[PDB]
Design a protein around this ligand. Structure first.
Ligand SMILES: Nc1ncnc2c1ncn2[C@@H]1O[C@H](COP(=O)(O)OP(=O)(O)O)[C@@H](O)[C@H]1O
Ligand SMILES: Nc1ncnc2c1ncn2[C@@H]1O[C@H](COP(=O)(O)OP(=O)(O)O)[C@@H](O)[C@H]1O
Ligand SMILES: Nc1ncnc2c1ncn2[C@@H]1O[C@H](COP(=O)(O)OP(=O)(O)O)[C@@H](O)[C@H]1O
Lengths: 483, 495, 497
């Protein structure tokens, strides 16, 4: 099981909504009037629709099996709904409802126009062959489609840590072959697809790059950094990453690239530490040939997590409860960057606020994958890769501008050519560059929105409450201005 | 006004008779000359009347419990371009003839600005002041339902819009009703209507669209030295004077943008009196005065005049209020050389004739009042796109500009050496502000400016082709009829 | 122009609704069992009556047509849907230069109330194309019909479950065939019920058997239902039944010919027949077969050997039943006191003015109203729409089954009697009568459609009689029919919320 399977994490999300809703309530009436505000907040909170399914599957041995599955759509204030599919025996209706609500607020902070949704199929994928996993995926797709729980403009699912791009390809193929055969946008019913099936370039590192951009947007704000007693920028900064999966590896590689020194890396099986620094390329290559980071030559072994290691930035990059009331006073980092959902308990949040430790919340920091999901759905609607018709146009304009400067100067008094970096940007220009710019822009715009919300309500370093209040304000306005 | 409907019909008749002879020559079909003329006249006869008019009677339960039968109508003038496009008026003065004439006006207005929609217009025979917001919502939602069931609202069928009598809240209710019921299975359901609030799929740059269109439309003609030499003036807004009649949203925006480019506002007219100052009137000072007193009367840096400013000595006259202002009696007393119609029908055909005799250039409403229509098209496109303009490219453009400046800096440092130091190539204060504040409204404004520039050149070329001179109104109608004709002709007129 | 084109006929229909709505209003508030105050219940009743009265939707069209000479022509047309309390809407299409939006609205409202009295589940509708069909070739009439169908379909004014048009006196079965063919080929291509989009179609295109005589049989059964009722006949000083009854028919079109043929078949004697060009009269009787054969070979009834010529109408001829079977204003305040008939059977829309109705009520003359008596074609049009939905002709699978059951019943009676009385004197053959044998042998769809029409007219006559007795209307059957229609339409709106 994950932290996203934990019933205490569902209570946490509910409590974050209740806290945010009570803060916005007084300001919303100013902008019978209290009945409309409370009434709309009461509509927003619960999931509008939950579908429970029972569907047959014929195993490879010939025997039949009844599979249990569910999908919750928290909100339709923005259609389609959006949300992953988890294949786990630890899934439940309450999980699927809470994670759907989390997705409504996560989409709102990053201005992604989707209501929240979440699906779960109660099976352990390790007990099934690829053929049986395909059968489960295709039949689940059919049952969701017949009830309005999958469609390009209705509900667009996505993969999870338990599901991948092959399963998403099967969902799109089943939908486009049967129920959505007459839909020109049938392949937009699901995201996380392979490139050969309508997938988007820049999806693999989307979450990791979002964590880097989210951290970068606060680390380069001198107002927030002066409160933490630090200088702006990644130079002369130290960081530790707990959880060395794909998000942890990507975040490690991106901070290192900008001058930050990785002092410690934590894993499910032990942790490594080096105050002089740990190279991400050397550590990734070691893990790819030994299965673990234990025994890394340029680091010392430690039995336990790196949460209390002396660093500036702590990055919980694994979906598990890590920061609690017992270890929160022992944290030596000034910034806690949540690269996964729910790594800090509400009691630890309170301790961090008392200790002047800035926690960049998961609702914002873990929304990079959700942002590039939106771009993949848009790419399938557009039916063209990003930049396909404008890269050559932009290149010619750039050359014409440099030629204009050269001719003007030769007339006045001189080769004006692109730098080695600009020439490489022009030559290698592809879809991933537009997706990366779109993700960086989204993360930057949302960081400023969260900072302005925190200043409007005098929340200081309580960025989590600011992010929830920002999300609730946006969802409220859609309901209020629609009638 | 029924006389305004007769005007629009007369403008079509005038334009259709002018194009008729040239259209038969351009027909490259393998037909006899008698069949070519039958085809041209036949297509012009199809274009003129409204194809469809729907009359509705629908019930509403008032807040007091009593029932009321509401009467409403919607005319779709043309389907040569789908969807249809046009506002909804809530007024007891609406009529089927009004809705038909304004739908036809919208067909020709869209054609001059290359907006791919046929014209449409709706009217609900009620006085909105007599209804609560709850009753206005009931009327709006039920009217939406009755239109949708008969093909008079839909993202690909007919896309309504607000009016002076209706607003963004009503448009939001239309989109919400359509997306909840008839268009529930449509991914583009929220594109069924424009003028929506930003939270419901509205577009940035909608509130100042008509005023910006009045500015850009005036600009394209005022920067053309050929047209300005005929009026005895120099090109550009520098050393130009202007007067605005009607201080609403269009009057204010036009006054702001003309002032920003060097033009001096000498007079401002309002429903209750007018003000005048030959040394100039500041738009920010006048707007602040009106916001705290409800009227422009008593403005300290201006003199009061009892009557309109239409005869005030200026270079540009801007009728920015929807009323008959320029008639055969006051047209010879107009002292302006350019009359910029920032509203529909402010000049009568008799006044147009006097202005042509006096060498006064009238920039017609069909062209100059299409800023809002142009931005309505972009809002509909935004809802189809399901993304705000520039969302994925602003950071990419920003990085490319800095890479461009870095390339110039490195190339110059390499050419002139290090003596005297580095040669910094940085953005101007204005360029930096453009980069930092880059948002959707800048792309919407750019598309509106491009539209007004391309349409001005099209109207100038049509006026030169038919030797119309300063008769820009006939040139705009002929331009619109030529475009509508070509769509019918190249599609075939019998299935 | 027809009586259905007359603006005074539209005012008449509006006045009939207003009269009926004021009568039902007081009784409707008493029957309301909702949890509302006695002041709020009057708002619901008056409010619903205010919604029912006007047409909900009117579509005005302008569409191009290429003439056979190559020139283009813009055609103006309209279709009004009065009510959607019952879907689809139903109503004819008129091709006439005398059509107007007001005509199409009033005739759509008339069709709503006509359908309600005969329990036909359709809201009223009516279309008009402003052209004189005599000025167009069959090819041009096809072009107009197909394009008009296309423009109606794109706006929800034609479709099997939306609006089902029908022919008129100005349109026929070939035009209906073109409507169904255009709809099924383009907009309704994916609809299994595309051919149910229009009625009055030829048999080869999904038409129903019994459609040509539908109006005439409805006039016969409508008259029959009141003429057999001894209570109503004693008030008029007559005996029940068609025996020893005399009748006169004004208008010798299809309604006039069919009505005359069925009344004669039941013992009624035709004393006079009126036509657009003069009239004929014979107090001893006029044979319908002899008169029909004469008109088919001479174009007119004038000069009929077994009858005398008369210049004017037969409205004042001494008879028991007067049947206005032509769409024109015939009975007015000037000739109503000269009418010698005791029953006036309206086989057309609006032949009697409200002033003449008042005179007939004062003279104890029973007027069987057009809303009821002219609903035979409307009833059979419902059956044609049902036949297209069913995708099978009526009786197709049950005629042979019914025949075998009838023979088994007769065999059971024969065997039981032979068992009871023995075989002295022989076998007791139980065989069908000559009439029953002919019914069994000739059993086809028209027999089921005729039974369906006869059942509808019988059930509706009793409903109108009960409404007239409930409101003490006596011989004012027109008000009873309008009140009956308004009560039914009101209940659909009231019980739907
Ligand atoms: N998931 C969401 N829920 C509610 N409001 C949203 C959501 N996503 C975006 N919005 C808001 O809807 C509006 C759409 O504005 P627009 O300029 O079209 O898009 P954006 O600026 O997000 O690219 C903004 O006010 C935005 O904050
Ligand atoms: N409302 C309209 N009615 C008729 N023709 C139109 C209309 N809007 C645009 N057109 C014409 O249709 C053509 C479409 O050209 P396109 O290049 O796709 O669009 P545009 O140049 O207007 O952006 C052009 O010739 C344009 O002038
Ligand atoms: N056009 C109509 N408008 C309103 N009510 C109608 C209409 N036609 C029928 N009704 C009523 O609706 C009900 C339907 O009853 P049902 O037994 O299904 O049909 P029917 O008895 O007419 O064959 C009856 O009470 C009937 O009187």
């Amino acid at each position: 099981a994950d932290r996203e399977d934990d019933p205490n994490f569902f209570k946490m999300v509910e409590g974050f909504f209740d806290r945010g809703a009570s803060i916005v309530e007084d300001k919303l009436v100013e902008d019978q009037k209290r009945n409309r505000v409370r009434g709309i907040l009461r509509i927003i909170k619960p999931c509008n629709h939950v579908l429970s399914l029972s569907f047959p599957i014929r195993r490879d041995d010939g025997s039949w099996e009844v599979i249990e599955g569910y999908r919750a759509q928290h909100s339709q204030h923005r259609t389609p709904c959006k949300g992953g599919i988890r294949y786990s025996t630890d899934v439940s209706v309450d999980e699927v409802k809470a994670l759907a609500s989390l997705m409504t607020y996560k989409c709102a902070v990053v201005d992604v126009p989707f209501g929240g949704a979440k699906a779960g199929v109660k099976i352990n994928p390790k007990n099934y062959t690829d053929n049986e996993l395909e059968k489960i995926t295709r039949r689940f797709t059919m049952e969701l489609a017949k009830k309005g729980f999958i469609g390009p403009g209705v509900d667009v699912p996505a993969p999870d840590m338990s599901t991948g791009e092959r399963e998403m390809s099967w969902i799109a193929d089943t939908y486009a072959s049967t129920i959505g055969h007459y839909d020109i946008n049938a392949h937009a019913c699901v995201t996380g697809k392979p490139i050969s099936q309508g997938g988007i370039h820049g999806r693999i590192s989307a979450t990791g790059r979002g964590v880097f951009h989210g951290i970068e947007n606060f680390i380069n704000e001198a107002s927030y950094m002066s409160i933490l007693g630090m200088t702006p920028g990644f130079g002369d900064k130290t960081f530790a990453v707990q959880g060395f999966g794909n998000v942890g590896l990507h975040s490690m590689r991106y901070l290192h690239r900008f001058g930050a020194k990785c002092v410690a890396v934590g894993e499910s099986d032990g942790s490594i530490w080096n105050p002089d620094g740990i190279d991400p390329k050397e550590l990734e290559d070691f893990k790819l040939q030994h299965g673990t980071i234990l025994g890394f030559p340029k680091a010392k072994i430690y039995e336990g997590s790196i949460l209390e290691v002396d660093c500036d930035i702590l990055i919980p990059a694994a979906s598990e409860k890590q920061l609690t009331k017992s270890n929160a006073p022992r944290v030596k980092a000034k910034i806690i960057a949540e690269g996964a959902n729910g790594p800090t308990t509400p009691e630890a949040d309170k301790i961090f606020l008392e200790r002047n430790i800035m926690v960049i919340p998961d609702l914002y920091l873990n929304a990079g994958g959700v942002t590039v999901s939106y771009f993949e759905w848009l790419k399938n609607l557009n039916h063209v890769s990003y930049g396909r018709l404008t890269f050559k146009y932009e290149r010619d304009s750039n050359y014409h501008l440099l030629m204009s400067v050269q001719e003007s100067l030769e007339r006045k008094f001189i080769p004006i050519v692109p730098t080695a970096e600009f020439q490489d940007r022009i030559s290698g220009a592809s879809e991933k560059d537009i997706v990366h710019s779109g993700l960086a822009y989204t993360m930057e715009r949302s960081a400023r929105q969260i900072m302005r919300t925190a200043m409007k309500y005098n929340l200081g370093l309580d960025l989590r409450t600011a992010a929830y209040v920002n999300a609730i304000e946006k969802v409220f306005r859609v309901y209020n201005e629609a009638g």
